[PDB]
Symmetry: C3
Subunit: 146 residues, 3 copies
């Protein structure tokens, strides 16, 4: 206050206690939720209350074994739920593990501009949630209205 009412979010990773495969987040650590027109709904997803173009991003780090998760690539997907609609993938990134190298810590950065409908919402899928790296700083998600 007053220095906020742009629409923007930045949210921090947290481990799911359920079989997952969508990422959970919190409003903790270095977080942003600049106003009531974004919210973290659990979800866990970022829900916008205004239509328009948004820059949307995620970062996922994981630590992984090649010979153990041999299935085969890690992939993180930015996905969209719009009201009364099926779900879409917006972005995906793959990284390999590569059989048989050891618990390698790797990151993924995803980002682009998309239209959102009022009522929104965006989330992140991964193939390998147990392998995900829970920070600090390592795994995050957010958006900004342009």
């Amino acid at each position: 206050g007053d220095q906020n009412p742009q629409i923007a979010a930045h949210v921090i990773s947290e481990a799911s206690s359920k079989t997952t495969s969508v990422l959970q987040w919190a409003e903790k650590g270095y977080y942003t939720m600049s106003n009531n027109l974004v919210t973290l709904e659990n979800g866990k997803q970022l829900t916008v209350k205004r239509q328009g173009l948004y820059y949307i991003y995620a970062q996922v780090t994981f630590c992984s074994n090649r010979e153990a998760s041999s299935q085969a690539p890690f992939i993180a997907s930015l996905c969209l739920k719009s009201p009364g609609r099926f779900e879409r993938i917006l972005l995906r990134a793959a990284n390999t593990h590569s059989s048989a190298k050891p618990c390698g810590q790797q990151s993924i950065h995803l980002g682009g501009v998309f239209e959102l409908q009022p009522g929104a919402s965006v989330f992140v899928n991964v193939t390998d949630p147990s392998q995900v790296s829970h920070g600090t700083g390592f795994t995050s998600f957010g958006l900004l209205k342009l």
Copy 2:
């Protein structure tokens, strides 16, 4: 309409049928072209009609063999054509294949703020176009005016 006339683009990968090495794009899938002051020109490049600072980004995923493409690193470059000017690289990212691991799916994220002249334009170069991953969600390109 009306919810658009920011300058912004987001465009989706597509395979070239020519020996390449610049990426081709389409206005398909989750795409954005928010007004007539950006266009996808083929090219394929994003052409802006206004000067100013832009955030510009690409994401390139590829699937690659180490022992096969042994040449040696994959590199994706964000490059600039300005009117009556030579061409410049703005950003580059390298990823290794690493001789001899198998068709490993890897991604690259590129992004930064740059000045563009009226009439523009930006494109993406790669070393290894055949290895590029054509989505969905995998390979993309765009920009936003700040």
Copy 3:
């Protein structure tokens, strides 16, 4: 002039001549410093003179041996100095080297939205500065006010 007075920066890598581990930058090559309300202070850090939300990003490429830097992962961190405050990490990315593969060129992209206080400032830490790749286009840092 006039086409600038957004707050934005984009700055280019340069090798430290000191034992480091924070990255040095220059206002060279494709750089941006859109006004006196951002500066590159050495530092080297980006210092803002206004409070508010910023998109902040870095890209770090490095070339690395697994068996040589065996310690074990490369990590780049976006960090914050706020006036009269301790220092915080905003973002981190890890990449592995993976013992024993050869001088592999790899990149990292970091980015998110954060609040900055007047007087600011942000910088990038790495584990392995000697391994860092000094462009052109390879290693960069910047921000934009939203």
